[model samples]
Target: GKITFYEDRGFQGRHYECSTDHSNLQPYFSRCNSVRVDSGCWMLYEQPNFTGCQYFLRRGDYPDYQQWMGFSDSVRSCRLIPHSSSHRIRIYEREDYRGQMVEITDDCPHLQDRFHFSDFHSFHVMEGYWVLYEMPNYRGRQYLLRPGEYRRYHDWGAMNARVGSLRRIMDFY
Candidate 1:
């Protein structure tokens, strides 16, 4: 994936681009005003080293900071999230893979409505990639989950433990 950042709107001013993940971006540019994601999905953080607010991004055009959901024309860090090939997951009620579990292979608009649980403490990604939402019906904060094991919410690097909805990031043609 490639991400290009501009120092001013309309893709003007000095530009910097990268195809790899970065925790701190201050060294790349003095400021960020706009961005263009050429491919794959990406995460942009408001603070360096992946701290503070985060904004999700995918392959698209963002002529200005507003389109990229920036509170200001400042991006401190970024990372790419590759789309998964399969969509299989298991939600858990406790850490270390304990407690009741719910297996899902498709989009879940509302966890509580479908699985009788609104907050999941942990999860396991058996296959594919998924996006976790903080609100029902896929609203609010979004966290990207890839194939592997997540022992707890923190292990997933999520700021919260509430999982209101989820859906796979399907590779579209």
Candidate 2:
């Protein structure tokens, strides 16, 4: 996976290109106004050490930060998501993977449409990686989830159990 970060919009100004996960991007650039994903999918973090708000990006050109739904130009860390041929996840209405279980193998634009609920407390990521959205249609806070079991909403770094949408992380290019 390859990705380039620009200090200014339109791919201008000082830039940094990386093909692997970076814990601290401060040494490479002062700010991130634009980005170009030449290969794999990525999960960008607002703060260093992979903490704070997250943004998911696929192979494409983002002329400006808003294109990635960035709340600011402070992209401090990034991870190149491993490619997967298939995706699967199990969501539970109650914590610890109990109650109203639902299995999903594809992108869900609106969780409530199929789950009949807007909030889920636990998740068992059976395959691939995924991004959970706080609002439907992939809008709002983004949380990247690797293949694992989340016993509670906090286990996935969410303040609450309100998941409006979910999408698999896959190479688009």
Candidate 3:
């Protein structure tokens, strides 16, 4: 999977193309005005070193920053989300995949109500892709998860461990 970042909208201006993860983008460019996910899904961060707000992107063309749910044209970091084969995840109430756990196989409209918790510190994805929302009903910030283990909030590149909702990312072509 690869992504091309354009300094200007419509894929114009100086562009930086990357196929691997970039923790810090300062050496590559200053800002991103447009992007083209040539192959797989990706998660873009507003600040460098994968810090700050994040936006999810699937394989497709984003003519401008706005098209990718960006607040501004400044994209500082990006990470590609590999595809998964199943849709199962284990949410842990503490970091390092320790503490109370809940296994889920479907959409969770409200994590607090369904899991009896409002914040989960870590999680392990046994299979498939999912989206964790900061607010219930899929509103607010979203973090994409593939088959893997996230030991803490930072592992997911999030501001906090406050996950309000979760939804499976069905194949959408």
Candidate 4:
């Protein structure tokens, strides 16, 4: 065979390094889109830019060793993976929102936990509250993003204080 790193190809090994730069670009790793990295064979890599921002990349095979690299116009078209507890529905507990709640539905993988910290992103937060949803990254942590919001992830246990329910987290704005 030959060395081919195509857009929808799968790279599996102990020495494969992967990196992605999404700057000056549209959004990615979202529920509406099938773009993702499998945690099993993927060792996703990222380097910080001058703006203190790290890039994103994905690796790994699908449930049946399938490579799901086909991008989607929207994350809603993709189905939640197995054992994906949240099902794109994570609750947030906010004291600032008068204990009111907001739901976010990004397609990343770190936000699917019961409790975890999340990276900082402006899109995940709205009106002083971070939205909640399933994470697209298989090997990531979850947390309430006070500084921003999760694109494809959700902060775990962010809904504890809300005492409310955020159903059908979405990307429809």
Residue 23 accuracy (lDDT) in model 2: 93
lDDT of 2: 0.91
Model 2: residues with Cα > 4 Å off, grouped in runs: 116-118
For candidate 2, the TM-score is 0.96
Kindly list the per-residue Cα lDDT of model 4 for residues 131-152, writing each as its tens digit. Answer: 2222344222223233344333
Higher lDDT: candidate 3 or 4?
3
156 in model 2: Cα distance from truth in Å?
A: 1.4
For model 3, residues 96-135, the per-residue Cα lDDT tens digits are 9888899988888988888666558898988887888887
Q: Candidate 4: where are CA atoms >4 Å away?
A: 1-5, 8-20, 24-59, 62-96, 100-131, 134-173
TM-score for predicted model 1 compared with the true structure: 0.79
Q: Which candidate model has the greater TM-score, 2 or 3?
A: 2
Clashing pairs in 1: none
Error of 4 at 73 (Å): 7.2
lDDT of 3 at 149: 85
- Name the top TM-score candidate: 2
Candidate with the greatest lDDT versus the true structure: 2
Better structure of 2 and 4 per lDDT: 2
| lDDT, model 2, position 140 | 89
lDDT of 1 by residue, 65-173 (tens): 7775566777888878776766899998788888889998899898887775545788899998787777787676667777889998787667768778887875443
